[PDB]
Design a binder for this molecule. Structure first.
Ligand SMILES: N[C@@H](Cc1ccc(O)cc1)C(=O)O
Ligand SMILES: N[C@@H](Cc1ccc(O)cc1)C(=O)O
Lengths: 373, 365
């Protein structure tokens, strides 16, 4: 009754069948013929996942499904993930299995996995930099992580071939994979993600302190301030765990920050407009530079600068030209470079051939283009 | 026709001139430091005449509007105080701080002349008069700070002059204005720049910091792209308010350092919840002290022509885009393409047009 090919295809287990996990399942299915068996704490999400062909089967027996699996994917909250990794370490898994997770911090998970498997099993921590942690499987899409950074943190022993193999499993995501060591990941994300969270909340809180003394503050904090502070509305539970899990990195950062504010306090209070202006100019120069896609980093960036006018259809025209030439654009931005209605449009391409081609096509249409600034 | 003088014919000033003209039949004579901006303003019917003689134009004027940098404004106010102006004149400025300008005006005029400091809380991606528009300040707060003696009738008169802006006018005292804007606008600009600077410090030690720069970090620091010149003046002019704020902030960070280092997840959670609760309570889709981004996030697939399709749709609806980006670091942000608009009406319109073409879109809550 069942087809020999269906019986015999590879098998995946997904633990946590929500937005993130469901999306990963769709990206897997897109490029691999597999039986995905799914598991959730909430039985409605797995059943819906099944209905939506996000998973193939609902897991009766967790152990049976795991022991026959070529790939096991955790998309659960990090407490639950620890508890289930323990269970997994009790099981008799296949020799060739790959196990992976999703989480914003890596230190504690990886510390647990070295402690339970050592060198038996190929556990590779993961962090896809896209989407949301609580939202449903109805929203899951194969392209959710497309062109997003997806960090992989392999155990110390895992061969490079297994890391490449996992990249192949997730090929369908279209993510830019970076392989980092665990400390590297928590350090970087600490500076670049977690610490801003703290500062965002702080800003909001500072403003609320004063809002009782004039109600106008609540009115004037609409629009820009509210937009700036967006991340402060994220889950307090999730973020308190992140902060607890990356505590030491953040303590150090806060100490440097206090120090920076003390120097800023000296600059502001000295009242030297030249020094103040310098402080702002340094920040502007750097902030204007982002993305600063470096030469030997992943992925490569080949930029072209175009003189375009601030009018309806300017971008439509430029992008239609490029599309007609069958050139794919990796990024674009408007940089406001001087006065007047002109702006500079920066277009990024995947490789040098494509930039060259775009330069010619735009030139034949009487666009002025540049290589720098 | 009544006669208006505009001193500073750029985005802000030019826009004010257009809003005046919209509801009043007047001769607007313009003046600038840069002769090109005033000549362009004339070409564009933003001003009617280019001022030959500054004093002549000021002495016949019913309304005088300064839209210049606050240093130049002090210098020109001094000149004005030397002139023989009309009995009924109204004089007003545009400036992000009020303390120093008002202080100077009480010192030069005292109770003779009706000076009313002004602050329109709106801005733009551009700087020149070519970008000026009558509706620039529509539904924006526009603060008025009248001298101590100015009768309420003259404040109402000025509101009538500027009816065309569509702004919501608030009459504040000068200290109140600098205190509030200090908390709500200036101080965040300082913190934004500080964050950028903190991050750059570390970027030499790992280049991944440049690459992996998160969405949240980018968002809170977007304002760090504003004019360093303008902001350094603002900071110098509101120095004492900011020194106090920075001191409180240092203290807050020290308490946060205790909370984080104590490791109590309940207390940490409370800190975040307090911030969320408050932030969630702030008005939805209104204008405040920091110009908004008016961003729209769009779900698109990476294939040739994806951007072309989206921008064509928007252009056909005659919506002008201020910016756009493909986000590679977008945790918590559904939708890969971020489009920025000039104002809320345009974002709304773009959302409908894209929706009708079966694009999924998102907006931040
Ligand atoms: N407004 C243009 C894009 C643009 C924006 C700002 C500029 O400075 C230049 C061009 C469009 O809709 O296509
Ligand atoms: N490559 C698309 C734009 C795009 C880029 C990255 C994406 O993830 C999605 C869409 C174009 O050339 O129009």
């Amino acid at each position: 009754e069942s087809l020999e090919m269906r019986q015999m295809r590879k098998k995946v287990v997904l633990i946590g069948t929500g937005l993130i996990g469901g999306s990963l399942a769709l990206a897997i299915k897109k490029d691999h013929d597999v039986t995905i068996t799914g598991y959730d704490i909430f039985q409605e999400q797995v059943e819906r996942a099944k209905e939506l062909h996000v998973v193939d089967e609902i897991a009766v027996d967790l152990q049976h499904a795991c022991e026959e699996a070529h790939l096991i994917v955790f998309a659960s909250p990090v407490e639950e993930t620890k508890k289930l990794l323990h269970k997994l370490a009790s099981f008799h898994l296949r020799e060739d299995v790959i196990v992976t997770d999703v989480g914003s911090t890596k230190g504690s998970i990886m510390n647990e996995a070295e402690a339970l498997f050592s060198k038996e099993i190929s556990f590779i921590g993961g962090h896809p930099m896209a989407g949301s942690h609580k939202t449903g499987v109805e929203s899951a899409k194969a392209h959710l992580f497309e062109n997003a950074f997806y960090i992989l943190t392999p155990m110390h022993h895992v061969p490079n071939e297994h890391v490449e193999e996992l990249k192949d499993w997730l090929k369908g995501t279209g993510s830019h994979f970076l392989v980092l060591n665990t400390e590297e990941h928590d350090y970087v994300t600490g500076i670049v993600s977690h610490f801003p969270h703290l500062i965002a909340a702080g800003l909001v809180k500072q403003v609320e302190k004063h809002a009782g003394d004039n109600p106008l503050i609540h009115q004037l904090a609409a629009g820009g301030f509210k937009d700036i502070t967006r991340i402060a509305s994220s889950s307090p539970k999730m973020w308190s765990d992140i902060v607890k899990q990356n505590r030491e990195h953040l303590m150090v950062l806060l100490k440097e920050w206090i120090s920076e504010m003390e120097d800023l306090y000296d600059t502001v209070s000295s009242g030297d407009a030249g020094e103040i202006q310098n402080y702002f100019a340094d920040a502007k120069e750097y902030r204007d530079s982002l993305p600063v896609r470096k030469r030997g980093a992943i992925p490569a960036y080949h930029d072209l600068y175009v003189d375009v006018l601030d009018k309806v259809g300017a971008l439509a025209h430029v992008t239609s030209i490029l599309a007609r030439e069958e050139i794919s654009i990796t990024n674009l931005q408007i940089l406001e470079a001087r006065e007047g209605l002109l702006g500079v449009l920066r277009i990024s391409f995947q490789r040098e051939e494509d930039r060259m081609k775009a330069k010619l096509a735009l030139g034949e249409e009487k666009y002025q283009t540049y290589e720098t600034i």
